[PDB]
C-alpha cells in the first residue's frame, strides 16, 4: 500500500524504497535534474531527497563542505 512520493498514487508495480520514502520504478529520479535513477545508480541524500552524483558536484563549495563535515 506504499504511495509514490512523486506522483502521489498507490504504487502498482515494484516499489523503490529509499530515504524512508517510496517511488514507482518509473518515478524514481534525481530531485535536481529529474534524470531517472535506480538504486544501483550513484546518488547522495540531500534533505532526504535523491541527488545524482553529477548534480551534487555542481552544488556550491560552501554547502558541500558543510554537508561533508556533518
Amino acid at each position: 500500500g506504499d504511495v509514490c512520493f512523486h506522483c502521489n498514487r498507490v504504487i502498482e508495480g515494484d516499489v523503490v524504497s529509499a530515504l524512508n520514502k517510496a517511488w514507482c520504478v518509473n518515478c524514481f529520479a534525481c530531485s535536481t535534474c529529474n534524470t531517472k535513477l535506480t538504486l544501483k545508480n550513484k546518488f547522495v541524500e540531500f534533505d532526504m531527497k535523491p541527488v545524482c552524483k553529477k548534480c551534487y558536484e555542481k552544488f556550491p563549495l560552501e554547502l558541500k563542505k558543510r554537508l561533508k563535515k556533518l
Binding site: N8, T35, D47, M48, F59, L70
Partner: protein, 206 residues
C-alpha cells in the same frame, strides 16, 4: 542535440517531457519555439544561467513539473501561479529574496522546493498559505527567523524542511499537521519549543 532540435522533436513526436538541464541557457525567450510547446508536462531547466522567468511561462499551460534548480533567478512573474496543473516546482539554488504577488494561487502544487535562496518570512506573499495542496515544502538554507502560524493551513504537509535557517522558535501550529513525517530543523537557533510540538530532537542547532 541542439535546443532547436529538442523543441522540434518534442513537437513532432508530441513528447511531454523536455530536458534542457545544463545547456548554458541565459534567457528562456532565446530557446527557439520553447513557448509553442503547449502540450508539455515537464520542463527541466536546472543548471543554466537564467536570471528571470518571462511571463510567457503561462503559455506552457499543461506543465506538471517545472525545474529551475541552480540558476541565478532573482524574480518570478506573477504568471508563474497561473499554471493550473503544476504539481512540482523546483526553485532551489537561485537568488530569490521575494516571490511575486499571488504566488499562492497555484491550485495543484504538491511539492515546492525553495532550498538555498535568500528567503525569509517577509519574502512570503500574503497568500502563500493558500497552497493547501502542498505535501512537501523545502525551505532549507534560507533566512527565516520566524515561521508564521499559517503553516498550520497546509494540512496535507508530509515534509517540512527548515534546515539551516535562523529560526529562534517554531509555531505550535506545526503540531496540527497530522500527516507530517519529516521535520528538518537542524542548524537553526532553537532553544525551547511550545509544548504542543512535544519532544523534538533539538540536536545540531547553531
Amino acid at each position: 542535440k541542439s535546443l532547436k532540435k529538442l523543441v522540434e522533436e518534442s513537437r513532432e513526436k508530441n513528447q511531454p517531457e523536455v530536458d534542457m538541464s545544463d545547456r548554458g541557457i541565459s534567457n528562456m525567450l532565446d530557446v527557439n519555439g520553447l513557448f509553442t510547446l503547449s502540450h508539455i508536462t515537464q520542463l527541466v531547466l536546472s543548471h543554466n544561467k537564467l536570471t528571470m522567468v518571462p511571463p510567457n511561462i503561462a503559455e506552457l499551460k499543461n506543465l506538471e513539473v517545472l525545474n529551475f534548480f541552480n540558476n541565478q533567478i532573482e524574480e518570478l512573474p506573477t504568471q508563474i501561479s497561473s499554471l493550473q496543473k503544476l504539481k512540482h516546482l523546483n526553485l532551489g539554488m537561485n537568488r530569490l529574496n521575494t516571490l511575486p504577488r499571488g504566488f499562492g494561487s497555484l491550485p495543484a502544487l504538491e511539492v515546492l522546493d525553495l532550498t538555498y535562496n535568500n528567503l525569509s518570512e517577509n519574502s512570503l506573499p500574503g497568500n502563500f498559505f493558500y497552497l493547501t495542496t502542498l505535501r512537501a515544502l523545502y525551505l532549507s538554507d534560507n533566512d527565516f527567523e520566524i515561521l508564521p502560524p499559517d503553516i498550520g493551513k497546509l494540512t496535507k504537509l508530509q515534509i517540512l524542511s527548515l534546515r539551516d535557517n535562523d529560526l529562534i522558535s517554531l509555531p505550535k501550529e506545526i503540531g496540527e499537521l497530522t500527516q507530517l513525517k519529516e521535520l528538518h530543523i537542524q542548524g537553526n537557533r532553537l532553544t525551547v519549543l511550545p509544548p504542543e510540538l512535544g519532544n523534538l530532537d533539538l540536536t545540531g542547532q547553531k
